[PDB]
Structures are given as C-alpha cells and as structure tokens.
A paper describes a structure:
Here, we present the complete structure of the human TFIIH core complex in association with the CAK subunit MAT1, determined by phase plate cryo-electron microscopy (cryo-EM) at 3.7 Å resolution. Third, p62 residues 350–358 form a short α-helix that binds in a cleft between the two RecA-like domains of XPD, so that it not only closes the entrance to the nucleotide binding pocket in XPD RecA1, but also partially overlaps with the predicted location of the nucleotide itself, strongly suggesting a role for this p62 sequence element in XPD regulation. Second, p62 residues 266–287 are inserted into the DNA-binding cavity of XPD, in agreement with previous observations. In our structure, the p52 contribution to the clutch encompasses p52 residues 306–399, which, strikingly, assume the same overall fold as the XPD NTD, as hypothesized previously, thereby forming a pseudo-symmetric dimer of structurally homologous domains. The part of this insertion resolved in our map consists of a negatively charged linker and an α-helical element that contacts XPD directly.
Transcription factor IIH (TFIIH) is a 10-subunit protein complex with a total molecular weight of 0.5 MDa that serves a dual role as a general transcription factor for transcription initiation by eukaryotic RNA polymerase II (Pol II), and as a DNA helicase complex in nucleotide excision DNA repair (NER). The TFIIH core complex is composed of the seven subunits XPB, XPD, p62, p52, p44, p34, and p8, and is the form of TFIIH active in DNA repair, where TFIIH serves as a DNA damage verification factor and is responsible for opening a repair bubble around damaged nucleotides. TFIIH function in transcription initiation requires the double-stranded DNA translocase activity of XPB to regulate opening of the transcription bubble, and additionally the CdK activating kinase (CAK) complex, which harbors the kinase activity of CDK7 as well as the Cyclin H and MAT1 subunits. MAT1 serves as a bridging subunit that promotes CAK subcomplex formation by interacting with Cyclin H and CDK7, recruits the CAK to the core complex by interactions with XPD and XPB, and also aids in Pol II-PIC formation by establishing interactions with the core PIC.
Residue numbers in the entry:
A (entry chain C): 151 to 173, 183 to 200
B (entry chain G): 2 to 67
C (entry chain E): 16 to 274, 281 to 387
D (entry chain D): 7 to 458
E (entry chain C): 400 to 449
F (entry chain F): 8 to 72, 95 to 206
C-alpha cells in the first residue's frame, strides 16, 4: 500500500527517543524523529 | 635371531617413559625392561609383571604428593 | 514471610497428607466447554496478529511473553490445521508502530511453524500499531469470498496502542466489511480492544497462567458460530483423484511441480485447469477452484452432528453394570459417566478420550 | 595376572548353546520348554523367519531367504541366518538342481509346534488329586522366601554371620570360581569374579549360576539335557497353580533339593510330592533387567550431581554393595547417604571391577524420581566414573615372543608374512626390525627357520 | 437369515482342532510362491520407471 | 512392548452362508487362525500383549480378555477363554431383521479406548506401540460412514496403525482406513 501503509506516529519523546544525537549538538539523522517533528510541530 | 620370550607392554607414551624411569631406578628388583620396541610398547620380564601391576599405580600415586 | 505456617496437623500422620492433598487438589482445575447446534464458520481465513512490542519482553510468563506466546501459537497452528483442513492462517508481527506481513495466508503448517521458529530470534523493539495490522489484515481479507468467516486473532500485550490515524473508522469499515476480530489480551483490559471485540463480533480475553492461555487458544481453535450477517454461499469445489505414473510411465506427463522441486512423475491433477499439484488440499493457484480429497470434508463432520453431555455421577448409585462399556475395565474410582441416548457406562479415561478425540459415543453406533 | 584380568563375561545363551555338540542339541529340543526358550532368545529377523517357515514341509531355496529382505539391511541380516544355521535350526537340504534348500530341524520344529498347538507329551505336569494343600504357600510369601534364601547366599558371599549355606552350595561357590578357599582351615574369601558377580542383575546372577553350574555338570552324575529342560520348564511356569514331583528321576530329586538350597524353588518337605516355582525361577532369562527400573524391586538410589547417593532401602547386603563402589556417611532407618569419591572407585577397581558394572548397577536401581530423565544418570557423573576406570586400567598385558636385529630385510618380511599366514602376528615394526609373534605359536616359525 | 443362523449355531458347538485342521503345507508352499516376487499379490508394482 | 488388537468380523449370516456352502474354509479355521496368530504374537516376546474383539451383528463383545496338553501355560488359558467366549457368543444368539449387516465402527472404538487405557497402564521406562488388525469377511453397511471416518482419525491421532485382511470382498472404507 505505502512504505508501511502509513508512517509511525509521534508516540511520545519525539525529542527524547534518541535525544539530540544520531551518534549537546550531536548528529541529527534519525528518520522517525525528523518525520515526527514534521508532523507534530 | 635373538629369540627372547618376554612380555609386551602397551600403554600411552607418558607411562612408557615412566616405566623407563622406574626401570632406570631399579625399583622392582632387576633391570626388568629389555628394550624399547616402539614409540609406545615396552618389553618386561614375565614374573615381575604382578609387582609391576601393584607398584606402578602405587608409585604414580606417590609421585603426586611431594 | 511466614508461609511455613500453612501446614496444620490434627493427628499429624494423615493430617499432613490431608494438607498436601488439599494443596495438590487446589493446584488443578477443569475446562469449560460449550455445545451448540448452530451454524458455524467452517471455511475460515484466520489471520494472527502478534505483538512485537516492548511489553513482549516482560517476564510475567516463565520465559518472556514472546517465547511463550510463540510456543502456544506453534501449538495453535498445529491443532488448527489438525482440525480444520480447508482453512488458512497468516501471521503478522506488529513492531515499531508498523505492521509486517510475516507469513502470507496459506494452508500448510510447515511454512508457518518454520517462520515461528525463525521469529523466536527477533528483537521486539518499539510500541505496536493496531491500525496498520488491522489494515494489512483487511487489505488481504477484502477479497476472500463472502462465505468465508474472515477472522483475525490479535494476541495483544501492551497498553499504548500507537496508531497513526483514527481507529474508529477502521472499526466502522471492518464492521461493514463483515470481518471478525478477536483479541487475546495480556496483563490488562483495554477499552479500545473491548470496543473492537464487541463491535466487530469477536471475543476479548485476558490471561492468568499457562493453562488459562492454552484454554483460550483452544477456545479459538474450534469454528466459532456465525452472525446473522455472513453470506451462506455454495463454493464450487474440485475433487482431484491421485494419479501415479500411469502404467510404468507408458505415455506419462513428466512435470516439475507447481509450487527447488524435482521431476514429478505423477500425483494430483486439477479438474479445472489440469495442472500438477503434489499435496492436497491446495487452493488452485491458477484457477480459483478449491481442491479437496474428501476425507478433508470428513475430518470436520463432527461439528455438524455434535456430541452431547455425559451425565456425571460420582457415587455408587444402582450400578448393576460394574464394568466400563468403553474398554471393559472396573470402575475403581468414584466417577461414573452415563450417556444420554443409550445410557451405558463410561469411566474417566473413556470420558476424556471420547469427548476429546473419538468425538462419538461408542454405544450409539451399535 | 601375567594374562589379562578376570572380566566377568555373560554368555547370553548364544555362546553357551553355540559351541556344544549337535547331538546334545537334537536331544535338547525334545521338550517344548527348550524350544520356546531358544525361540525367544533369537533376534527378531530369525524370530519371524522361524515363525514363517514353521508350517512347511519343503526346503525353500536360498534365493527366497536372501530375497525376503530389503536392500539396506543386508549387514544386519546375515547374523540371523548364521545364528539359525550354527544353532542347528536351519539344516541345509538340496532342491534337485543346485538350489541349497533350507529346512527347520524337525525335532525343533515339531516341539515348537507342540509349544504353540496341541501336543503328545504333557509338559511333566501331574496331580493325582490334592486340593487346597496342607500349608499352602502364599504368593507374597513366595516373594519373601525368594528374598530370604537368595539374600542368605549373597550374605554368605559377602561374609556375614548369616552363613546358612549347607556346604554343598559353598563347594559350588568355590568350584565356579567365586569364593576361593585358601589355607584350608576355612577362610572362604571372595575372588574378583565374586565382586563382579555381586554388582550384577538378579536374573543375570542366577543365569550365571546356572551356566557355571552346568559348566561342571560332569561331576555328580548330571546330564546337561534334562537339567536345562527342567530350568526352561521352571521359567515357563506360574506362581499360582501348584505342581507335583511324580515323573522325576532320583538325580532330578538331588538337583531339585540342591535347587531348594538355591532358593529358586519352595518345597514343603524333602520327602514331599510338591514344589512351588518361586519368583526368582520365572524371571530366569538370559537378558537385562533394565536401565531405569526392575520388575523385581523398584529402584531406590538417587544419584545427584553432588556425587551423592541417596539409598532409600534398609538392607545389609545392598549397604555392603554401596560400600563397595562408594563410601557411606549417614545411616537413617529409611535412608543411607553416601558419596562417590574418586578414592572409593579406585578402591572398587583395585579389588577388580570394570566400571560398566557400577553404571549399570546404578541404572538398575534408579529411584522413580530419578526417572523421567532421558539420561537417567547425570552424564557428568557417569563420564567421570568412566574416566576414573580409564585412569586405573591403563596397562594392557600380552605374552609375546621377540624377533630383533635380523641380518637382512627379505627374511624380515618373510617371517612377517609367515606370521600373517598362520595368524600368529601380534606386533610388527617398519624400521628397526623389532617383531612380536605369539609365543605359543612361535615353534611353528622356529621349526620353519630350521627348514627355511 | 434363518438358514445361516441354524448352520452357525450348529457350527460353533464342536470346536478346537489346532494341529490338524489349520494348515496344509502345500497351501503354505503356494502362499510363499505367491508372495515371492513373481506371483500373485506381488503386483509388479513400485517400479516407477523414470 | 507391543499390542496387537485383532478384530474378527463374525457376521453369523456370512459365515452361515459359508458353512452351508460346504467349502473347506469355515468359521472354525478362521477363529483358529486368529488364535494361532495370537499365540504367535504372545510367543514372539514376553512383553507382548493381546486382545481379540469379535464384531457381532448387534454387539462388540471381546473374546480376550494347568497345561494339560503341552502348550505354554498362559497360551493355554488364553486359548481356553477365547474358545469358551466364542461358544458363549455365537451359540446363545438372537435374530432381528432391521439390523442384520455387520458393524466395524464400534469394535474399532472399543479397540481405540482399550489401547488408550493400556497406554495409561504403561510406566515411564517403557513405551507402547500399537496396531489393529481387522479380519473382514462380510459387506460393510454404508450407513455408518459418518461414524467410521471418526475412528480412523482417532487412529490417526493416537498413532495406532491399522491393518486389514479382507477375505471375500473388497471394502473401500477399510482400504481407506
Ligand atoms: Zn485449476
Ligand atoms: Zn450413547
Ligand atoms: Zn473405560
């Protein structure tokens, strides 16, 4: 249907799942986090 | 050629050279080992084989004490 | 911290025996089985949705919940294909807010149990998604024909049911798409699974033990009765005879297979398309016919002319027939079981054997 | 002990009956008890083949016997055919071309058919009429009598103050190689064969009694044939129904009262006309009592991973046996607590016990909580027992004769080839010409050297 | 029904020959001839020539 | 440890027509071949067990369950009880008209539950394998097919093998089983 027939909704801790680090100011590359921020805010 | 009717002794090489050591010390009465016919096998005078049967196990247990 | 005081004594010689017998009798229980002379859904595309949540890794069971759940699903696939041959199973692990069709809807236990032996080794990361799992199960179960009681079994553990959309429009759709969803729950009662179960048509249950969870999966093995909604059609069926290599392969038809195969000399044909199948029963891969050997209709005839109850009486009670009519043995216990129609005599071993396996009274045949 | 040590080998009724005279065998099958008793010993292939060919008067060719078996099993097939042939069941006849016909020995075949169907003899059962007998004996009291008498013999071997053996049986124990009398003012000792006899199963012990009893049956005017027919007549009898004696010779009376001394048969009086075949006499069979449990007595030794034996049985005999292969710490009126020390097993092999006796002893008396394990013993303990016996048994002795320092090398392989020719080769050399031949078979090659 | 009930009530009164009646040996020889691989009940089957 | 359960289709109408045929082969040699097979099975090993059932037209009565003439003793007692049981069964008999074709589903049901209880008798050391011989000589009624498949699937689950010697006529349900 789609990539997963939908996406992963922002459950909670979309800022604190792998917080500020795709390893503060660390790397930022996690797909769930950027898509959940794109939906959420 | 030189027909000797000794007794074959089959072991593992550790006890083979333990028998060689024990025969060099002459702890069963005579130089009871004739020659060394293999990497494994030994020859022994037939009548000291019973004192061998006791004292080899007894002296191996005595070597692990000092 | 003082459980040691649970052992009392009156004469202390058989009184410790009485306390041990009370404990050993209170550590066991009997099942609750229901009978019905009602329509059942006998062609049955069931579709199993397992959690792969974070709460699958919790150790409430003796191994973690993933391992016990998966072991009883291996037993479930075994007994369901042992009892309903026409039907099919498909397995979705629901993991990380997304749903994954782990094993497609097929009708042989080898692929499913192989996939469960694989799925022991998984990770169980993230929160589940009931939306996407019911969406994949709906997407496959739209276009099965209308006489199939299309059923989903959600073995569901966690509490945060992290959907990506609204899951009351799914329940309205699945209400209109005449599917039936039943949820077996772990550790709690969740309102959304309760609404889903009571509205789609299914049944919701929560788990105490190993034994209670086995009783629930055994309850979902049997074909559940139909609503006033499901279509009562007449599916066209095919009954292919077995065909060996005709007369020492005198003008045979050497084929490979039809779903790493060798050279098939003979076997099962199809009466619609004249293809080559090794195993029967198999839905026709290129026609849409369903192929039946017809003991596979006779393997599930006991649901239609079912058993009755045994009149259970423990006491001595007028028994002029001392021996078991089942297997010709004495009744050395105080449980005597007497049938309804013939009213012969049976013991406990004949009770469990007749009501679980043989599925008929030996008296009423005579 | 310049030979090898006394390894107690049970014959299992094949090496006994295979190795006799065929006239003795053709007399031996003259009672249906012996035909059933040799029948049940057979492997299952030979079993089914005798029951196939039983109702038949024609010598079937060799092709059908080789052609009754699927292809994969020919390695496990020729043993059954050869065992039927050597035991004088299949005597070979000829179809009138060249097909070697095979036919069952009509004495053996006729008496098996008497064992299955009606017969012309009467199994030596008799009763004039004697009803409920004066002091009729009860079945658990027959069990008690068996336990009492055979444990008295076992205590006599152990050397208790319960030495109720009546000195013909002690002479039998000295004659079979078990209790050696030395310095004849009456110490009866135990040979190492006696220690290996103790740790054995009860049907294996009784059948070893009957084998070494009939090994010296040339002494008291005994014949092997009638005694073995009476043994196989005992072990195919029933505890309940009662027998009579009328129809037996006087040497049979002497053997039956000697057998009463064994405890295998409960008499009432010496001049009586009745015997009760005891529960020891029925389970007389060349076989194994089990690996987890015994029909005689349920197992009682719990062997935990602590090398820890929990014996739930009060008996001075079995306490002495557990004292043989272990060392014992606690004794309660229900239980004995023992520990299997390395030094305890090394004492149990200094007196001479190969530790398959020990492991099978513990498997025989395995307690019913120790069951429901598929390896009924903990394999750490069992493999440790085997490693202890392999530390104790590290010398292998052989009397030989030396050939050393030959003058050439062609005569080296010539002497080696003549040794291989007459089957007297023992050990060879490749480099330094150091050969070992059999010393008893050396004089052949020695006189060959004086002939070249 | 009545004829067969009469004949089998008369039949199962006198009973048990065990040595004599059961097998003639020629029938057993013909049975071994049949179950040999070139006779009846050995259908020349399980060939499957590929 | 093995368990042969012979089932002999004692149709009195069929063997009555066979005994009025004045052939060589009557019911006496049938039940005698049954007993020689039974004594052979008990004879092959000490631990073997035997049970012999006789399907009559209206009842599944079991047949089974010193040495005067030279047999082994328990073989003699088993042969005596099988002989006396068929003499009590077939001679003292009845006559009805609506139900005259023989049955096989009920005797197989008794055999299945008998093997169940005798497998509960087995202790943990040993394990019982089992089979059911069916010696059929009559024509099976079609009317119990609904029943008959069920006992086959019970023998499918309980891992009991089924063998069949049919005497006169082929039988599709029994070769099916
Ligand atoms: Zn098709
Ligand atoms: Zn009934
Ligand atoms: Zn019963």
């Amino acid at each position: 249907x789609x990539x997963x027939x939908x996406x992963x909704x922002x459950x909670x801790x979309x800022x604190x799942x792998x917080x500020x680090x795709x390893x503060x100011x660390x790397x930022x590359x996690x797909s769930d986090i950027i898509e959940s921020i794109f939906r959420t805010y | 050629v030189n027909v000797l009717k000794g007794v074959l002794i089959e072991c593992d090489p550790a006890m083979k050279q333990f028998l060689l050591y024990l025969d060099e010390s002459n702890a069963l009465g005579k130089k009871f080992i004739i020659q060394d016919i293999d990497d494994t096998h030994v020859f022994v005078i037939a009548e000291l084989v019973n004192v061998l049967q006791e004292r080899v196990g007894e002296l191996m247990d005595q070597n692990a004490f000092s | 911290x003082x459980x040691x005081x649970x052992x009392x004594x009156x004469x202390x010689x058989x009184x410790x025996x009485x306390x041990x017998x009370x404990x050993x009798x209170x550590x066991x229980x009997x099942x609750x089985x229901x009978x019905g002379q009602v329509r059942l859904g006998m062609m049955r595309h069931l579709y199993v949705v397992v959690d792969g949540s974070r709460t699958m890794e919790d150790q409430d069971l003796k191994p973690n919940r993933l391992t016990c759940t998966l072991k009883l699903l291996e037993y479930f696939v075994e007994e369901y294909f042992d009892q309903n041959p026409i039907s099919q199973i498909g397995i979705i692990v629901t993991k990380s807010k997304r749903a994954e069709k782990l094993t497609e809807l097929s009708g042989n236990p080898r692929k499913h149990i192989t996939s469960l032996k694989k799925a022991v080794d998984m990770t169980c990361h993230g929160e589940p998604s009931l939306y996407n799992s019911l969406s994949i199960a709906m997407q496959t179960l739209k276009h099965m024909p209308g006489h199939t009681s299309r059923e989903v079994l959600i073995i569901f553990s966690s509490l945060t049911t992290c959907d990506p959309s609204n899951i009351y429009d799914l329940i309205k759709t699945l209400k209109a798409a005449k599917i039936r969803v039943s949820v077996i729950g772990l550790s709690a009662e969740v309102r959304v699974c309760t609404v889903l179960a009571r509205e789609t048509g299914g049944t919701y249950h929560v788990i105490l033990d190993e034994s209670h969870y086995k009783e629930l999966l055994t309850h979902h093995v049997s074909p559940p009765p139909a609503s006033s909604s499901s279509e009562c059609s007449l599916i066209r069926m095919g009954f292919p005879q077995h065909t060996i290599x005709x007369x020492x392969x005198x003008x045979x038809x050497x084929x490979x297979x039809x779903x790493x195969x060798x050279x098939x000399x003979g076997g099962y044909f199809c009466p619609q398309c004249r293809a080559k199948y090794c195993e029967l029963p198999v839905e026709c891969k290129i026609c849409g016919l369903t192929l039946v050997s017809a003991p596979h209709l006779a393997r599930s005839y006991h649901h239609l002319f079912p058993l009755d109850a045994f009149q259970e009486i423990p006491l001595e009670e007028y028994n002029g027939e001392r021996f078991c009519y089942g297997c010709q043995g004495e009744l050395k216990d105080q449980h005597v079981y007497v049938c309804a129609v013939c009213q012969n005599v049976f013991c406990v071993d004949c009770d469990v054997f007749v009501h679980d396996s043989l599925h008929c009274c030996p008296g009423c045949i005579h | 002990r310049g030979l090898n040590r006394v390894h107690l080998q049970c014959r299992n009724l094949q090496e006994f009956l295979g190795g006799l005279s065929p006239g003795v065998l053709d007399r031996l099958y003259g009672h249906p008890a012996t035909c059933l008793a040799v029948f049940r010993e057979l492997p299952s292939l030979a079993k089914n083949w005798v029951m196939r060919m039983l109702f038949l008067e024609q010598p079937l060719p060799q092709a059908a016997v080789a052609l009754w078996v699927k292809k994969e099993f020919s390695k496990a097939q020729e043993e059954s055919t050869g065992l039927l042939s050597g035991l004088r069941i299949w005597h070979t006849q000829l179809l009138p071309g060249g097909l070697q016909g095979l036919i069952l020995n009509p004495i053996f075949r006729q008496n098996l058919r008497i064992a299955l169907l009606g017969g012309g003899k009467a199994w030596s059962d008799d009763t004039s009429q004697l009803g409920p007998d004066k002091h009729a004996r009860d079945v658990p009291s027959l069990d008690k009598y068996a336990e009492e008498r055979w444990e008295v013999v076992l205590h006599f071997m152990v050397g208790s103050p319960s030495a109720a053996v009546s000195q013909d049986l002690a002479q039998l124990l000295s004659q079979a190689g078990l209790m050696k009398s030395t310095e004849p003012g009456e110490p009866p000792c135990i040979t190492s064969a006696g220690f290996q006899f103790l740790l054995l199963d009860t049907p294996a012990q009784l059948w070893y009694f009957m084998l070494q009893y009939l090994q010296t049956a040339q002494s008291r005017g005994m014949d092997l044939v009638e005694i073995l027919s009476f043994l196989f007549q005992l072990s195919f009898s029933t505890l309940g129904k009662d027998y009579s004696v009328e129809g037996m010779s006087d040497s049979l009376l002497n053997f039956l009262q000697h057998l009463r001394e064994f405890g295998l048969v409960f008499q009432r009086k010496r001049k009586s006309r009745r015997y009760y075949p005891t529960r020891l006499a029925i389970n007389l069979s060349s076989g194994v009592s089990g690996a987890g449990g015994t029909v005689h007595q349920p197992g009682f030794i719990v062997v935990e991973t602590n090398y820890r034996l929990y014996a739930y049985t009060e008996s001075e005999l079995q306490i002495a046996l557990i004292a043989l292969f272990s060392e014992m710490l606690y004794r309660f009126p229900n239980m004995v607590v023992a520990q299997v020390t390395r030094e305890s097993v090394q004492q149990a092999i200094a007196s001479g016990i190969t530790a398959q006796q020990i492991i099978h002893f513990l498997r025989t008396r395995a307690h019913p909580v120790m069951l429901k394990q598929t390896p009924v013993l903990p394999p750490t303990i069992t493999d440790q027992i085997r490693l202890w016996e392999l530390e104790r048994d590290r010398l292998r002795f052989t009397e030989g004769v030396l050939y050393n320092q030959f003058l050439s090398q062609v005569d080296f392989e010539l002497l080696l080839a003549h040794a291989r020719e007459l089957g007297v080769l023992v050990f060879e050399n490749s480099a330094k010409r150091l050969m070992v031949v059999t010393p008893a078979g050396h004089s052949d090659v020695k006189r060959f050297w004086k002939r070249q | 029904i009545i004829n067969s009930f009469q004949s089998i009530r008369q039949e199962m009164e006198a009973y048990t020959p065990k040595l004599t009646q059961v097998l003639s040996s020629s029938a057993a020889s013909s049975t071994i001839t049949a179950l040999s691989p070139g006779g009846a009940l050995m259908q020349x089957x399980x060939x499957x020539x590929x | 440890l093995n368990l042969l359960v012979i089932v002999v289709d004692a149709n009195p109408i069929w063997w009555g027509k066979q005994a009025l045929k004045e052939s060589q082969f009557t019911l006496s040699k049938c039940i005698d071949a049954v007993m020689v097979l039974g004594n052979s099975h008990l004879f092959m090993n000490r631990s073997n067990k035997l049970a012999v059932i006789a399907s009559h037209i209206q009842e599944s009565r079991f047949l089974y369950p010193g040495s005067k003439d030279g047999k082994y003793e328990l073989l003699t007692s088993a042969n005596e009880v099988i002989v006396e049981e068929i003499k009590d069964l077939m001679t003292k008999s009845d006559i009805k008209g609506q139900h005259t074709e023989t049955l096989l589903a009920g005797s197989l049901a008794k055999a299945l539950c008998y093997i169940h209880r005798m497998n509960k008798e087995v202790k943990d050391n040993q394990e019982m394998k089992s089979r059911i011989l069916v010696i059929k000589a009559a024509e099976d009624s079609a009317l119990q097919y609904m029943n008959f498949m069920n006992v086959i699937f019970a023998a499918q689950k309980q891992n009991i093998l089924i063998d069949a010697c049919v005497l006169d006529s082929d039988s599709g349900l029994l070769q099916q089983a």
